[PDB]
Each structure stands twice: as C-alpha cells, then as structure tokens.
Amino acid sequence: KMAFTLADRVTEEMLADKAALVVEVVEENYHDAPIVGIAVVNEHGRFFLRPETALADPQFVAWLGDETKKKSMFDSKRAAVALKWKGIELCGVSFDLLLAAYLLDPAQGVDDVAAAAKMKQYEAVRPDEAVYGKGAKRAVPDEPVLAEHLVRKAAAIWELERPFLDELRRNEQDRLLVELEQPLSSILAEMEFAGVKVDTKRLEQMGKELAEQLGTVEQRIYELAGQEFNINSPKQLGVILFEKLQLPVLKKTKTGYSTSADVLEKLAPYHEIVENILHYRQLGKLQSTYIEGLLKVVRPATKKVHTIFNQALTQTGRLSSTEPNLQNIPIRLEEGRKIRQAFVPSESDWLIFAADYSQIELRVLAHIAEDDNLMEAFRRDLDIHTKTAMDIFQVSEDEVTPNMRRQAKAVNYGIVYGISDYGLAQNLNISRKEAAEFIERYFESFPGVKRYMENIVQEAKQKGYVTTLLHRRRYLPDITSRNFNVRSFAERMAMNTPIQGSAADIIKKAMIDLNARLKEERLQAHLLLQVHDELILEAPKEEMERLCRLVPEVMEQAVTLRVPLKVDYHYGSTWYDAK
DNA sequence: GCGATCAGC
DNA sequence: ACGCTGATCGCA
Ligand SMILES: Nc1nc2c(ncn2[C@H]2C[C@H](O)[C@@H](COP(=O)(O)OP(=O)(O)OP(=O)(O)O)O2)c(=O)[nH]1
Ligand SMILES: [Ca+2]
C-alpha cells in the first residue's frame, strides 16, 4: 500500500543531497546492536536496503559520512551510535523528528515515528510496537513487512519536517532544535560510544568486602530484633518495628507502614536497630546497583561502560542516563564515594577532569526574577547554602559543618520551589510556626523571587505553558484544575521548570561550545559524561593545565546573565580524585 | 508491572 | 505538603 524499491544494490539516485533516512535498530540499548534494515526516501523515490549490502557499499558509506548530504531522521543518535559500532560515521543530519516533537511538547512522550506523526494528523505509519511486538514475543518481522514499515517511517519523516519546523518557528524554538539539540545529539553520540573505563578488579574487591560487611550488619539486626526476618520485606520489617518493638508510627504508605530513611532517622532515639537497618540498606544499595549492576553492563574486552543519554525524555529539558545510569553514582557517603575510584581514564597517562556550575539554578533564578538582593549575593560570589546554614543553625561561617550545609541546600531549593511550613518543619525538625516564620523572612530578604513565583504561576494560567531562557516549553494543563492538590503540583512545576530547564539549556550550550573549542585548540581531551550541572572529561596528563583555563571559561561564557556564572573544577587519576 | 525506596543533580 | 530523574526489589 506504499510503493518502494526493495533494492538489491545501491544506486546513484539513492544518494541525493536531501533524504529521509531510517537506520533501524530494534534493540532498546543500541550499543553494538544489529542494524536490521535501511530505508531512504528522497525526490527520486523510496528505497529499502539490506544493511549487509548497503553498509559494505563504499558509495553508500561515503554518502552517510558526507556532511553536505543532508538527512532527516527520527532519533539520529541511535542510528549514529549503532553505525559507530559498525565503524561507520554518520554526518549531515539536518532534521531529527524525535527532538522536534520533544521540543514542541515533551509530555507527548513521543518515542516512535507514529507518535510524532500523530501530532500532525499523519497516520500512514504504524507504531513500532505493533510491528515488532512486546516482550518475549518481540521479533523482527519478515522482510516485506519490515521493508514497508521502514519506508513508511521514512516517508513520514520526509512529509513531517516542514510542518514541524513551522510550528517550531512559531514557538521560537527552531534555533533551539537546529543550533542546540541537534548539535548536542552528535556530541552525546560521541560520549556514549567512547564510554567510561571501569577498574573491574577494584569493583570486584569492593563487592567482596561489601558482602561480608552486609553479613555482619545483618546478624546485628537479627540480634537487635531478637529474631530473623526478610529485612527487605516491608510487611516483616514493619511488623518488627511497629508491632514487635512497638515503635511509633510516624507515616503510612498506600500499602502499610512507611520505613523510608527519613522515618527511620526520626526513630533513632527509640531503638538502635533503625540505624542498622539504614546502614544495611545503604550497603545493599551499593552492592546491587553499583557493584553488581555495573559489572553486569561492563563490556569485558575493553572494561568500558556505555551509557545512553536520553535526550528526549525529561519534562524540563535535562538529560537522563540509562543502563547504566552514570548520573547517580554515589558520592555522598564515604563508603559510597569509593565506587568512583573504579571510574578511570581510558588510556595510560590520561586523567579525569570534572567541572561544575556552582548554584546555577539559583543564579538563573536571580537573573530571571531580577531580585536585587539575590543578584547582589551572587555578584559577591556568596555561597548561599553556607549563608543559609549560618542563619538556620545560628552559627558563624567556620562553624558551618558539611551536614549543616547539605541541610541548608535543601532549604534553599525547597523554599523557592514552594515547600510548605509543614515540609520545612519536618525537614529541620522545628516547630511548624518557626518554619513558617523562616519562610516569611526568606521572602522578605528576596521579595523579587516571591513576586516572580506569583507572576510565573499567573503567566502559566494565561498562556497554558511556561518556557525556559532558550524557549523550551512545558504545557501545564493542570494549572487550572479544580482539584486543589492537582492544581498545586502544577503551580510548583511552573515555579521549577523554567529554572531547572534554563540551567539545562545553559549546560547544553556549554557542551557545544566546549567541543568546538577543544577542536580549535587541537586537544585530545573529550567529554565523557554530563551530570546536569557538571561536565566530566578525560585527557592526556599534558593537557590538564590548558583545560584548567579552557573549560571553566567556556562554561562561564556559555550565556551572559545579570549575575556571573561560577565554575569549580578538579582533576585526578580517577573520577573519585576529580572531586 | 507498580510502588516504595534511595542513588544523584 | 520543594523539583527532575533511573535501578532495585518485594508485592501489604
Ligand atoms: N528542587 C531541588 N533541586 C535540587 C536539590 N538538590 C539539587 N537540586 C538541583 C538543582 C540544581 O539543578 C542542581 C544543584 O545541586 P548541587 O548539588 O550541584 O548543589 P549547588 O550547585 O546548589 O551547590 P554546590 O555545588 O554544593 O556549591 O541540582 C533539591 O533538594 N531540591
Ligand atoms: Ca554544582
């Protein structure tokens, strides 16, 4: 029902200077994954190519790598990385339908061509799940069915580029697609393919030491409980704490007793078993998520882990990191931080270099709210978390402990993003009236932030959405809901999304500028990871001194705000030593 | 499969 | 009853 050539060899009319291209990788993790078929739609017609012929054809490989042969695609990073694993470079991607749909409305959750096409009343393509199936029944269909599906996706990309670009233009997002998200997609492809080297000997040794510490703590828990149980059984654990030992019940879940760490910490005066349960959970989290989980995904021959940065998933424009998630590697507790000693440079005599924005969301807030006092604080390069810690605990600067500062950091973000006196009192273990008076004093120091937060909620009600500094958009239909709780969540999204999303925009532009600068200086240094407000690179030891001046400057100059941007940086022999 | 939990930002 | 995530695991 759609005409196409099931081609046996590559022809010159397949290599036009503008085409929709489909390079199909069905496996969810596309690293080293098979390419199961290729489709090309252009002015001369529609073509399906088998990969084992197309990707060994030197003219087709040449066409893929030619920047001047422009390709429209959906999820071009998936294609670029799968091709890198075949030794083939993809260049010239000038339109990515996945990123275009994500920019127009992140809430759509668009994850295949059919879902994007449905945004523009295009329905002549099937969902990928309808073609490949679900779960244990998932499979590549017979060639004619596959070929028609890939050609139909290519034809959809071909037809949808103009209406998508037109809507992007009306939203002031066309440069956001073409100058920011699409260039970043190629950089992420390089980072994912490069991978991060892991010291598996060290991780395995930690895993063994962890397993015996686990056993010890576990016996102590059974000892303190007077019996044995499944410490991870909510029913049994709840039964132990709140029925056998008769500890107060401070919180319930939909299903029974809460045993979250904040509850257990509040029960510490009542019984020393809860501190052991906490320690046990923390150890088991390291063991199962970061020891076993990381060893499971390491490529054995290179000792590299290859994350996938999801660029079209979060509602604020942040990236996420999957399989493994390299944006939530422990750092907070010393036992957990040592996991980072296992993350090492990929060559000998190279080092890890890490640079991060200091308080970028609060600096962005000061700029957007034009709050006189908050702008002055950052113009003085004040550490607002220490200053808040001094006010909370009524101490002087040198008397601000690391834990006090971490607490004040959650007070700072909490208050500007709408925490209530109740939530603040519960976090600081102060009276609710004290917490409310503190919040009042906080907005007396920062009335521009208060005004901005009231204004942005009203702007979302009027427009139906909020935007970031680089014109990312989030629709907030619930902000006019009649249910108070549904409305309130939407109001806090209107307060938070433009700030968190603008900080996401800035670091993305910084990455693009950084790569252009590394290329211009002819450095071997390259990005490995982004962790929201941090960039992690590796480079020859002999490049570190140049990177100490280059990277912070690139990051600080990514945008110009009414307050300066501030970058801290470290380097060392492992990721551990680079912070 | 989902909710609770917890690791990061 | 501040926000944004992903992985594990028990299932009340
Ligand atoms: N709403 C909220 N956001 C947070 C919280 N903690 C971190 N974030 C987000 C906001 C920012 O995008 C980013 C900043 O967190 P960081 O740990 O990097 O601390 P920050 O830069 O504020 O200070 P520091 O690095 O310690 O000088 O992470 C929090 O408790 N609540
Ligand atoms: Ca930071």
Residue numbers in the entry: 298 to 876
What does the original paper state about this entry?
Polymerases generate nascent strands of genetic material by stepwise phosphoryl transfer of nucleotides to primer termini, yielding O3′→P5′ phosphodiester linkages. We reported that 3′-NH2 primer extension can be catalyzed by a modified DNA polymerase, yielding N3′→P5′ phosphoramidate DNA (NP-DNA). The large fragment of DNA polymerase I (BF), cloned from the thermophilic soil bacterium Geobacillus stearothermophilus (Bst), acquires nontrivial levels of N3′→P5′ polymerase activity via two surprisingly minor substitutions: (A) a single active site mutation (F710Y) and (B) substitution of its divalent Mg2+ cofactors with Ca2+ (1). To add evidence that a single divalent metal ion cofactor catalyzes unnatural NP synthesis in BF, a polymerase A family member, we carried out a single nucleotide primer extension reaction in intact crystals.
The conserved Asp-830 side chain, proximal to the nucleophilic primer 3′-amine at ~2.5 Å in refined ground state structures, is the most likely general base mediating this proton transfer. Unlike for native phosphodiester catalysis, only a single metal ion cofactor is detectable by crystallography during NP catalysis.
